[PDB]
Amino acid sequence: AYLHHMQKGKMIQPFGCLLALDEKTCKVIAYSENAPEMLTMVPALGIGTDIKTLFTAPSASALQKALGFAEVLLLNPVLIHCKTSGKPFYAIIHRVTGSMIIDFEPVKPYEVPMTAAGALQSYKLAAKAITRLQSLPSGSMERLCDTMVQEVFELTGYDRVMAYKFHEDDHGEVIAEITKPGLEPYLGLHYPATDIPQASRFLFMKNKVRMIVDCHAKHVRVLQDEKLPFDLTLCGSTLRAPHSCHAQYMANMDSIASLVMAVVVNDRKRLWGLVVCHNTTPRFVPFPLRYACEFLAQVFAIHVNKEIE
Amino acid sequence: LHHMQKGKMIQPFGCLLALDEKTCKVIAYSENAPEMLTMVDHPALGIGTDIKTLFTAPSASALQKALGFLLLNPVLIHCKTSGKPFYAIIHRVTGSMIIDFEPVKPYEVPMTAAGALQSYKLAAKAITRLQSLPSGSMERLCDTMVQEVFELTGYDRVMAYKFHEDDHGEVIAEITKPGLEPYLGLHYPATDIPQASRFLFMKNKVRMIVDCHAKHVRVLQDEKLPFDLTLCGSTLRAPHSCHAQYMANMDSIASLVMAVVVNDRKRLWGLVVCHNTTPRFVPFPLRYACEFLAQVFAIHVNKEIE
Ligand SMILES: *[C@H](C)[C@H]1/C(=C/c2[nH]c(/C=C3N=C(/C=C4\NC(=O)C(CC)=C4C)C(C)=C\3CCC(=O)O)c(CCC(=O)O)c2C)NC(=O)[C@@H]1C
Ligand SMILES: *[C@H](C)[C@H]1/C(=C/c2[nH]c(/C=C3N=C(/C=C4\NC(=O)C(CC)=C4C)C(C)=C\3CCC(=O)O)c(CCC(=O)O)c2C)NC(=O)[C@@H]1C
């Protein structure tokens, strides 16, 4: 049941908007319902729209040029400007067979001159983290995980950061934790397997970093071309809305916002666990920082697998 | 020392402005800056020009904020009429804020963040390969460093150049494109690298020369400025004429040099030296990534001695 509704991914979070394009025609074959408002000035946006009508000439050309690379050759994000408004967005591209799917995340105008500076700064901080993991003496899973949650806490600014390990019966245990002062600790607690369905663990193998900005936000529908006789697969989107059971789960534990990083060993390939960030209030972090976190989690996974041996 | 610090020439691949640390107005500029930044009241660019007349408002605001600091480089700026974009690289000296401007292709502006992330990722992967090395073999450590830099930077030749106790140098590792003659193993006199150059490398850890044959450009300053403006910290500083000549005879038209400073007790261990047969330019984000790679390399060198 869970996998169907997560794979189709027809509901997104409202912090961004989504377009899907036909690789052959470059025209819009699906869009989220908030996309006309975000990207135009309400020359419309609908099924069949050409993207050269929406963005400035260098922007349209950069996206058009992405159509011609293999996915492993995609460099994200792309900085685009809207043609009428001048509004800037980060465009995050991925491919599913003959479709190109694009997530658009807003950028503040005063942030634009700092886009390269901020990207370098995020990766530099992550790189300094990697050196401290590596400097650590071997022999203690506990010290390794403490160092990791401490580094992530400083890098990401969330109220709570946990290392969550899966046991062989698939139930989980919180084995390391750092929080801001007032909060209730979860260190040492065990949780049922069913708190994280099989389908979610499966998706984490491919989508290694997941952000939920606000569990109470009103989700937005994706509309697709009525001519299509199948559903598009949108689960690779950075914007996919959380299933309502989990959004209800979040509100109950006063984690209004979250950032989760998969820890995949032998990347025998196995989901060892998760690094779980919670925030009491809504929180957004831009793509370059999440991208750096993905690499930090990869290196962490190498050290985890070393200690096992 | 006094025609590297008080020498007033830059390489022509970019241009330079210096601004007064209080008024924010132009107190020095390279002779190529008017055509590069305005396309040639008053001559649009001279002593006393206000940066609000040169750049779009978001661009000028971002530079005003930097004068208020802490520095994250580079800043992406657009010129006011042309919309012509540059990377602005900022540093401070006692009297002034100095800005090096390196051009960006207008149609590449959408990919600036993407390219910066990719540069740092490749350097971060190189860092993990150095770390995973079994300790004990200085040869293996240095061979790995030159291989990674070669792949990252795309230069024709990459060598590790070690300083001996008498300050003479030795090439102890090297990788080149096929068919180039090796220099591995050669010893060179201490005088090839004067002490003044060594002292600069302590502060400016990455130095790029795009084309030893390029015609250098003068920096003009107000003659009543109560101090002498130094260019030691500019990414654009011209090579000394002895070295421009030294490079031509050895068919290194372009170079990229990384200092290797241990106990960063502080001493210059050596250099990672990249050479190219033809002119070569690499953008600031890649040089910035190389700086961190060089610091991490220095730590492993220091470990090997001990
Ligand atoms: C509804 C009947 C059942 C249900 C479904 C469900 N859960 C998830 C996803 C996650 N569940 C967790 C669990 C935890 N988070 C924590 O912080 C802790 C320790 C305090 C636990 C145990 C996590 C981390 C996830 C991943 C969330 C993410 O991707 O950010 C899903 C998938 C949701 C989606 O839309 O991707 C579903 C469907 N949960 C229940 O408890 C019910 C039994
Ligand atoms: C002129 C009278 C003397 C002189 C001066 C001089 N040298 C440098 C700087 C450098 N010299 C070297 C030397 C080498 N490069 C190599 O590739 C090799 C081995 C194959 C050697 C021995 C290097 C690497 C530098 C640094 C250059 C840089 O910053 O990119 C300077 C500094 C130039 C400047 O303006 O910074 C000067 C003045 N060289 C001679 O040979 C004379 C004896």
Numbering used by the authors:
A (entry chain B): 69 to 110, 121 to 345, 360 to 401
B (entry chain A): 71 to 110, 119 to 147, 151 to 345, 360 to 401
Article passage:
On the same basis, however, penetration of omnidirectional light into the thin, plate-like microcrystals would be adequate. In order to collect diffraction data for Pfr at the XFEL, we thus irradiated the sample in the capillary that feeds the slurry to the jetting nozzle with a 630 nm LED array, allowing ~ 45 s for dark relaxation to the final photoproduct before the sample arrived at the X-ray focal spot. Paying particular regard to the Y242 rotamer, the Pfr occupancy was estimated to be ~ 11% and ~ 23% for the A- and B-protomers, respectively. It is unclear why the occupancies of the chains differ. We analysed the global changes associated with Pr→Pfr photoconversion using Fo(light)-Fo(dark) maps and difference distance matrices. The largest electron density differences are associated with the chromophore region of chain B, consistent with the higher Pfr occupancy there. From the distance difference matrices, specifically chain A shows a slight general shift of the nPAS domain, whereas chain B shows slight shifts of residues K78-V110. Both chains show shifts corresponding to helices Q276-K286 and H321-D332 (blue and red stripes in Fig. 2b, respectively).
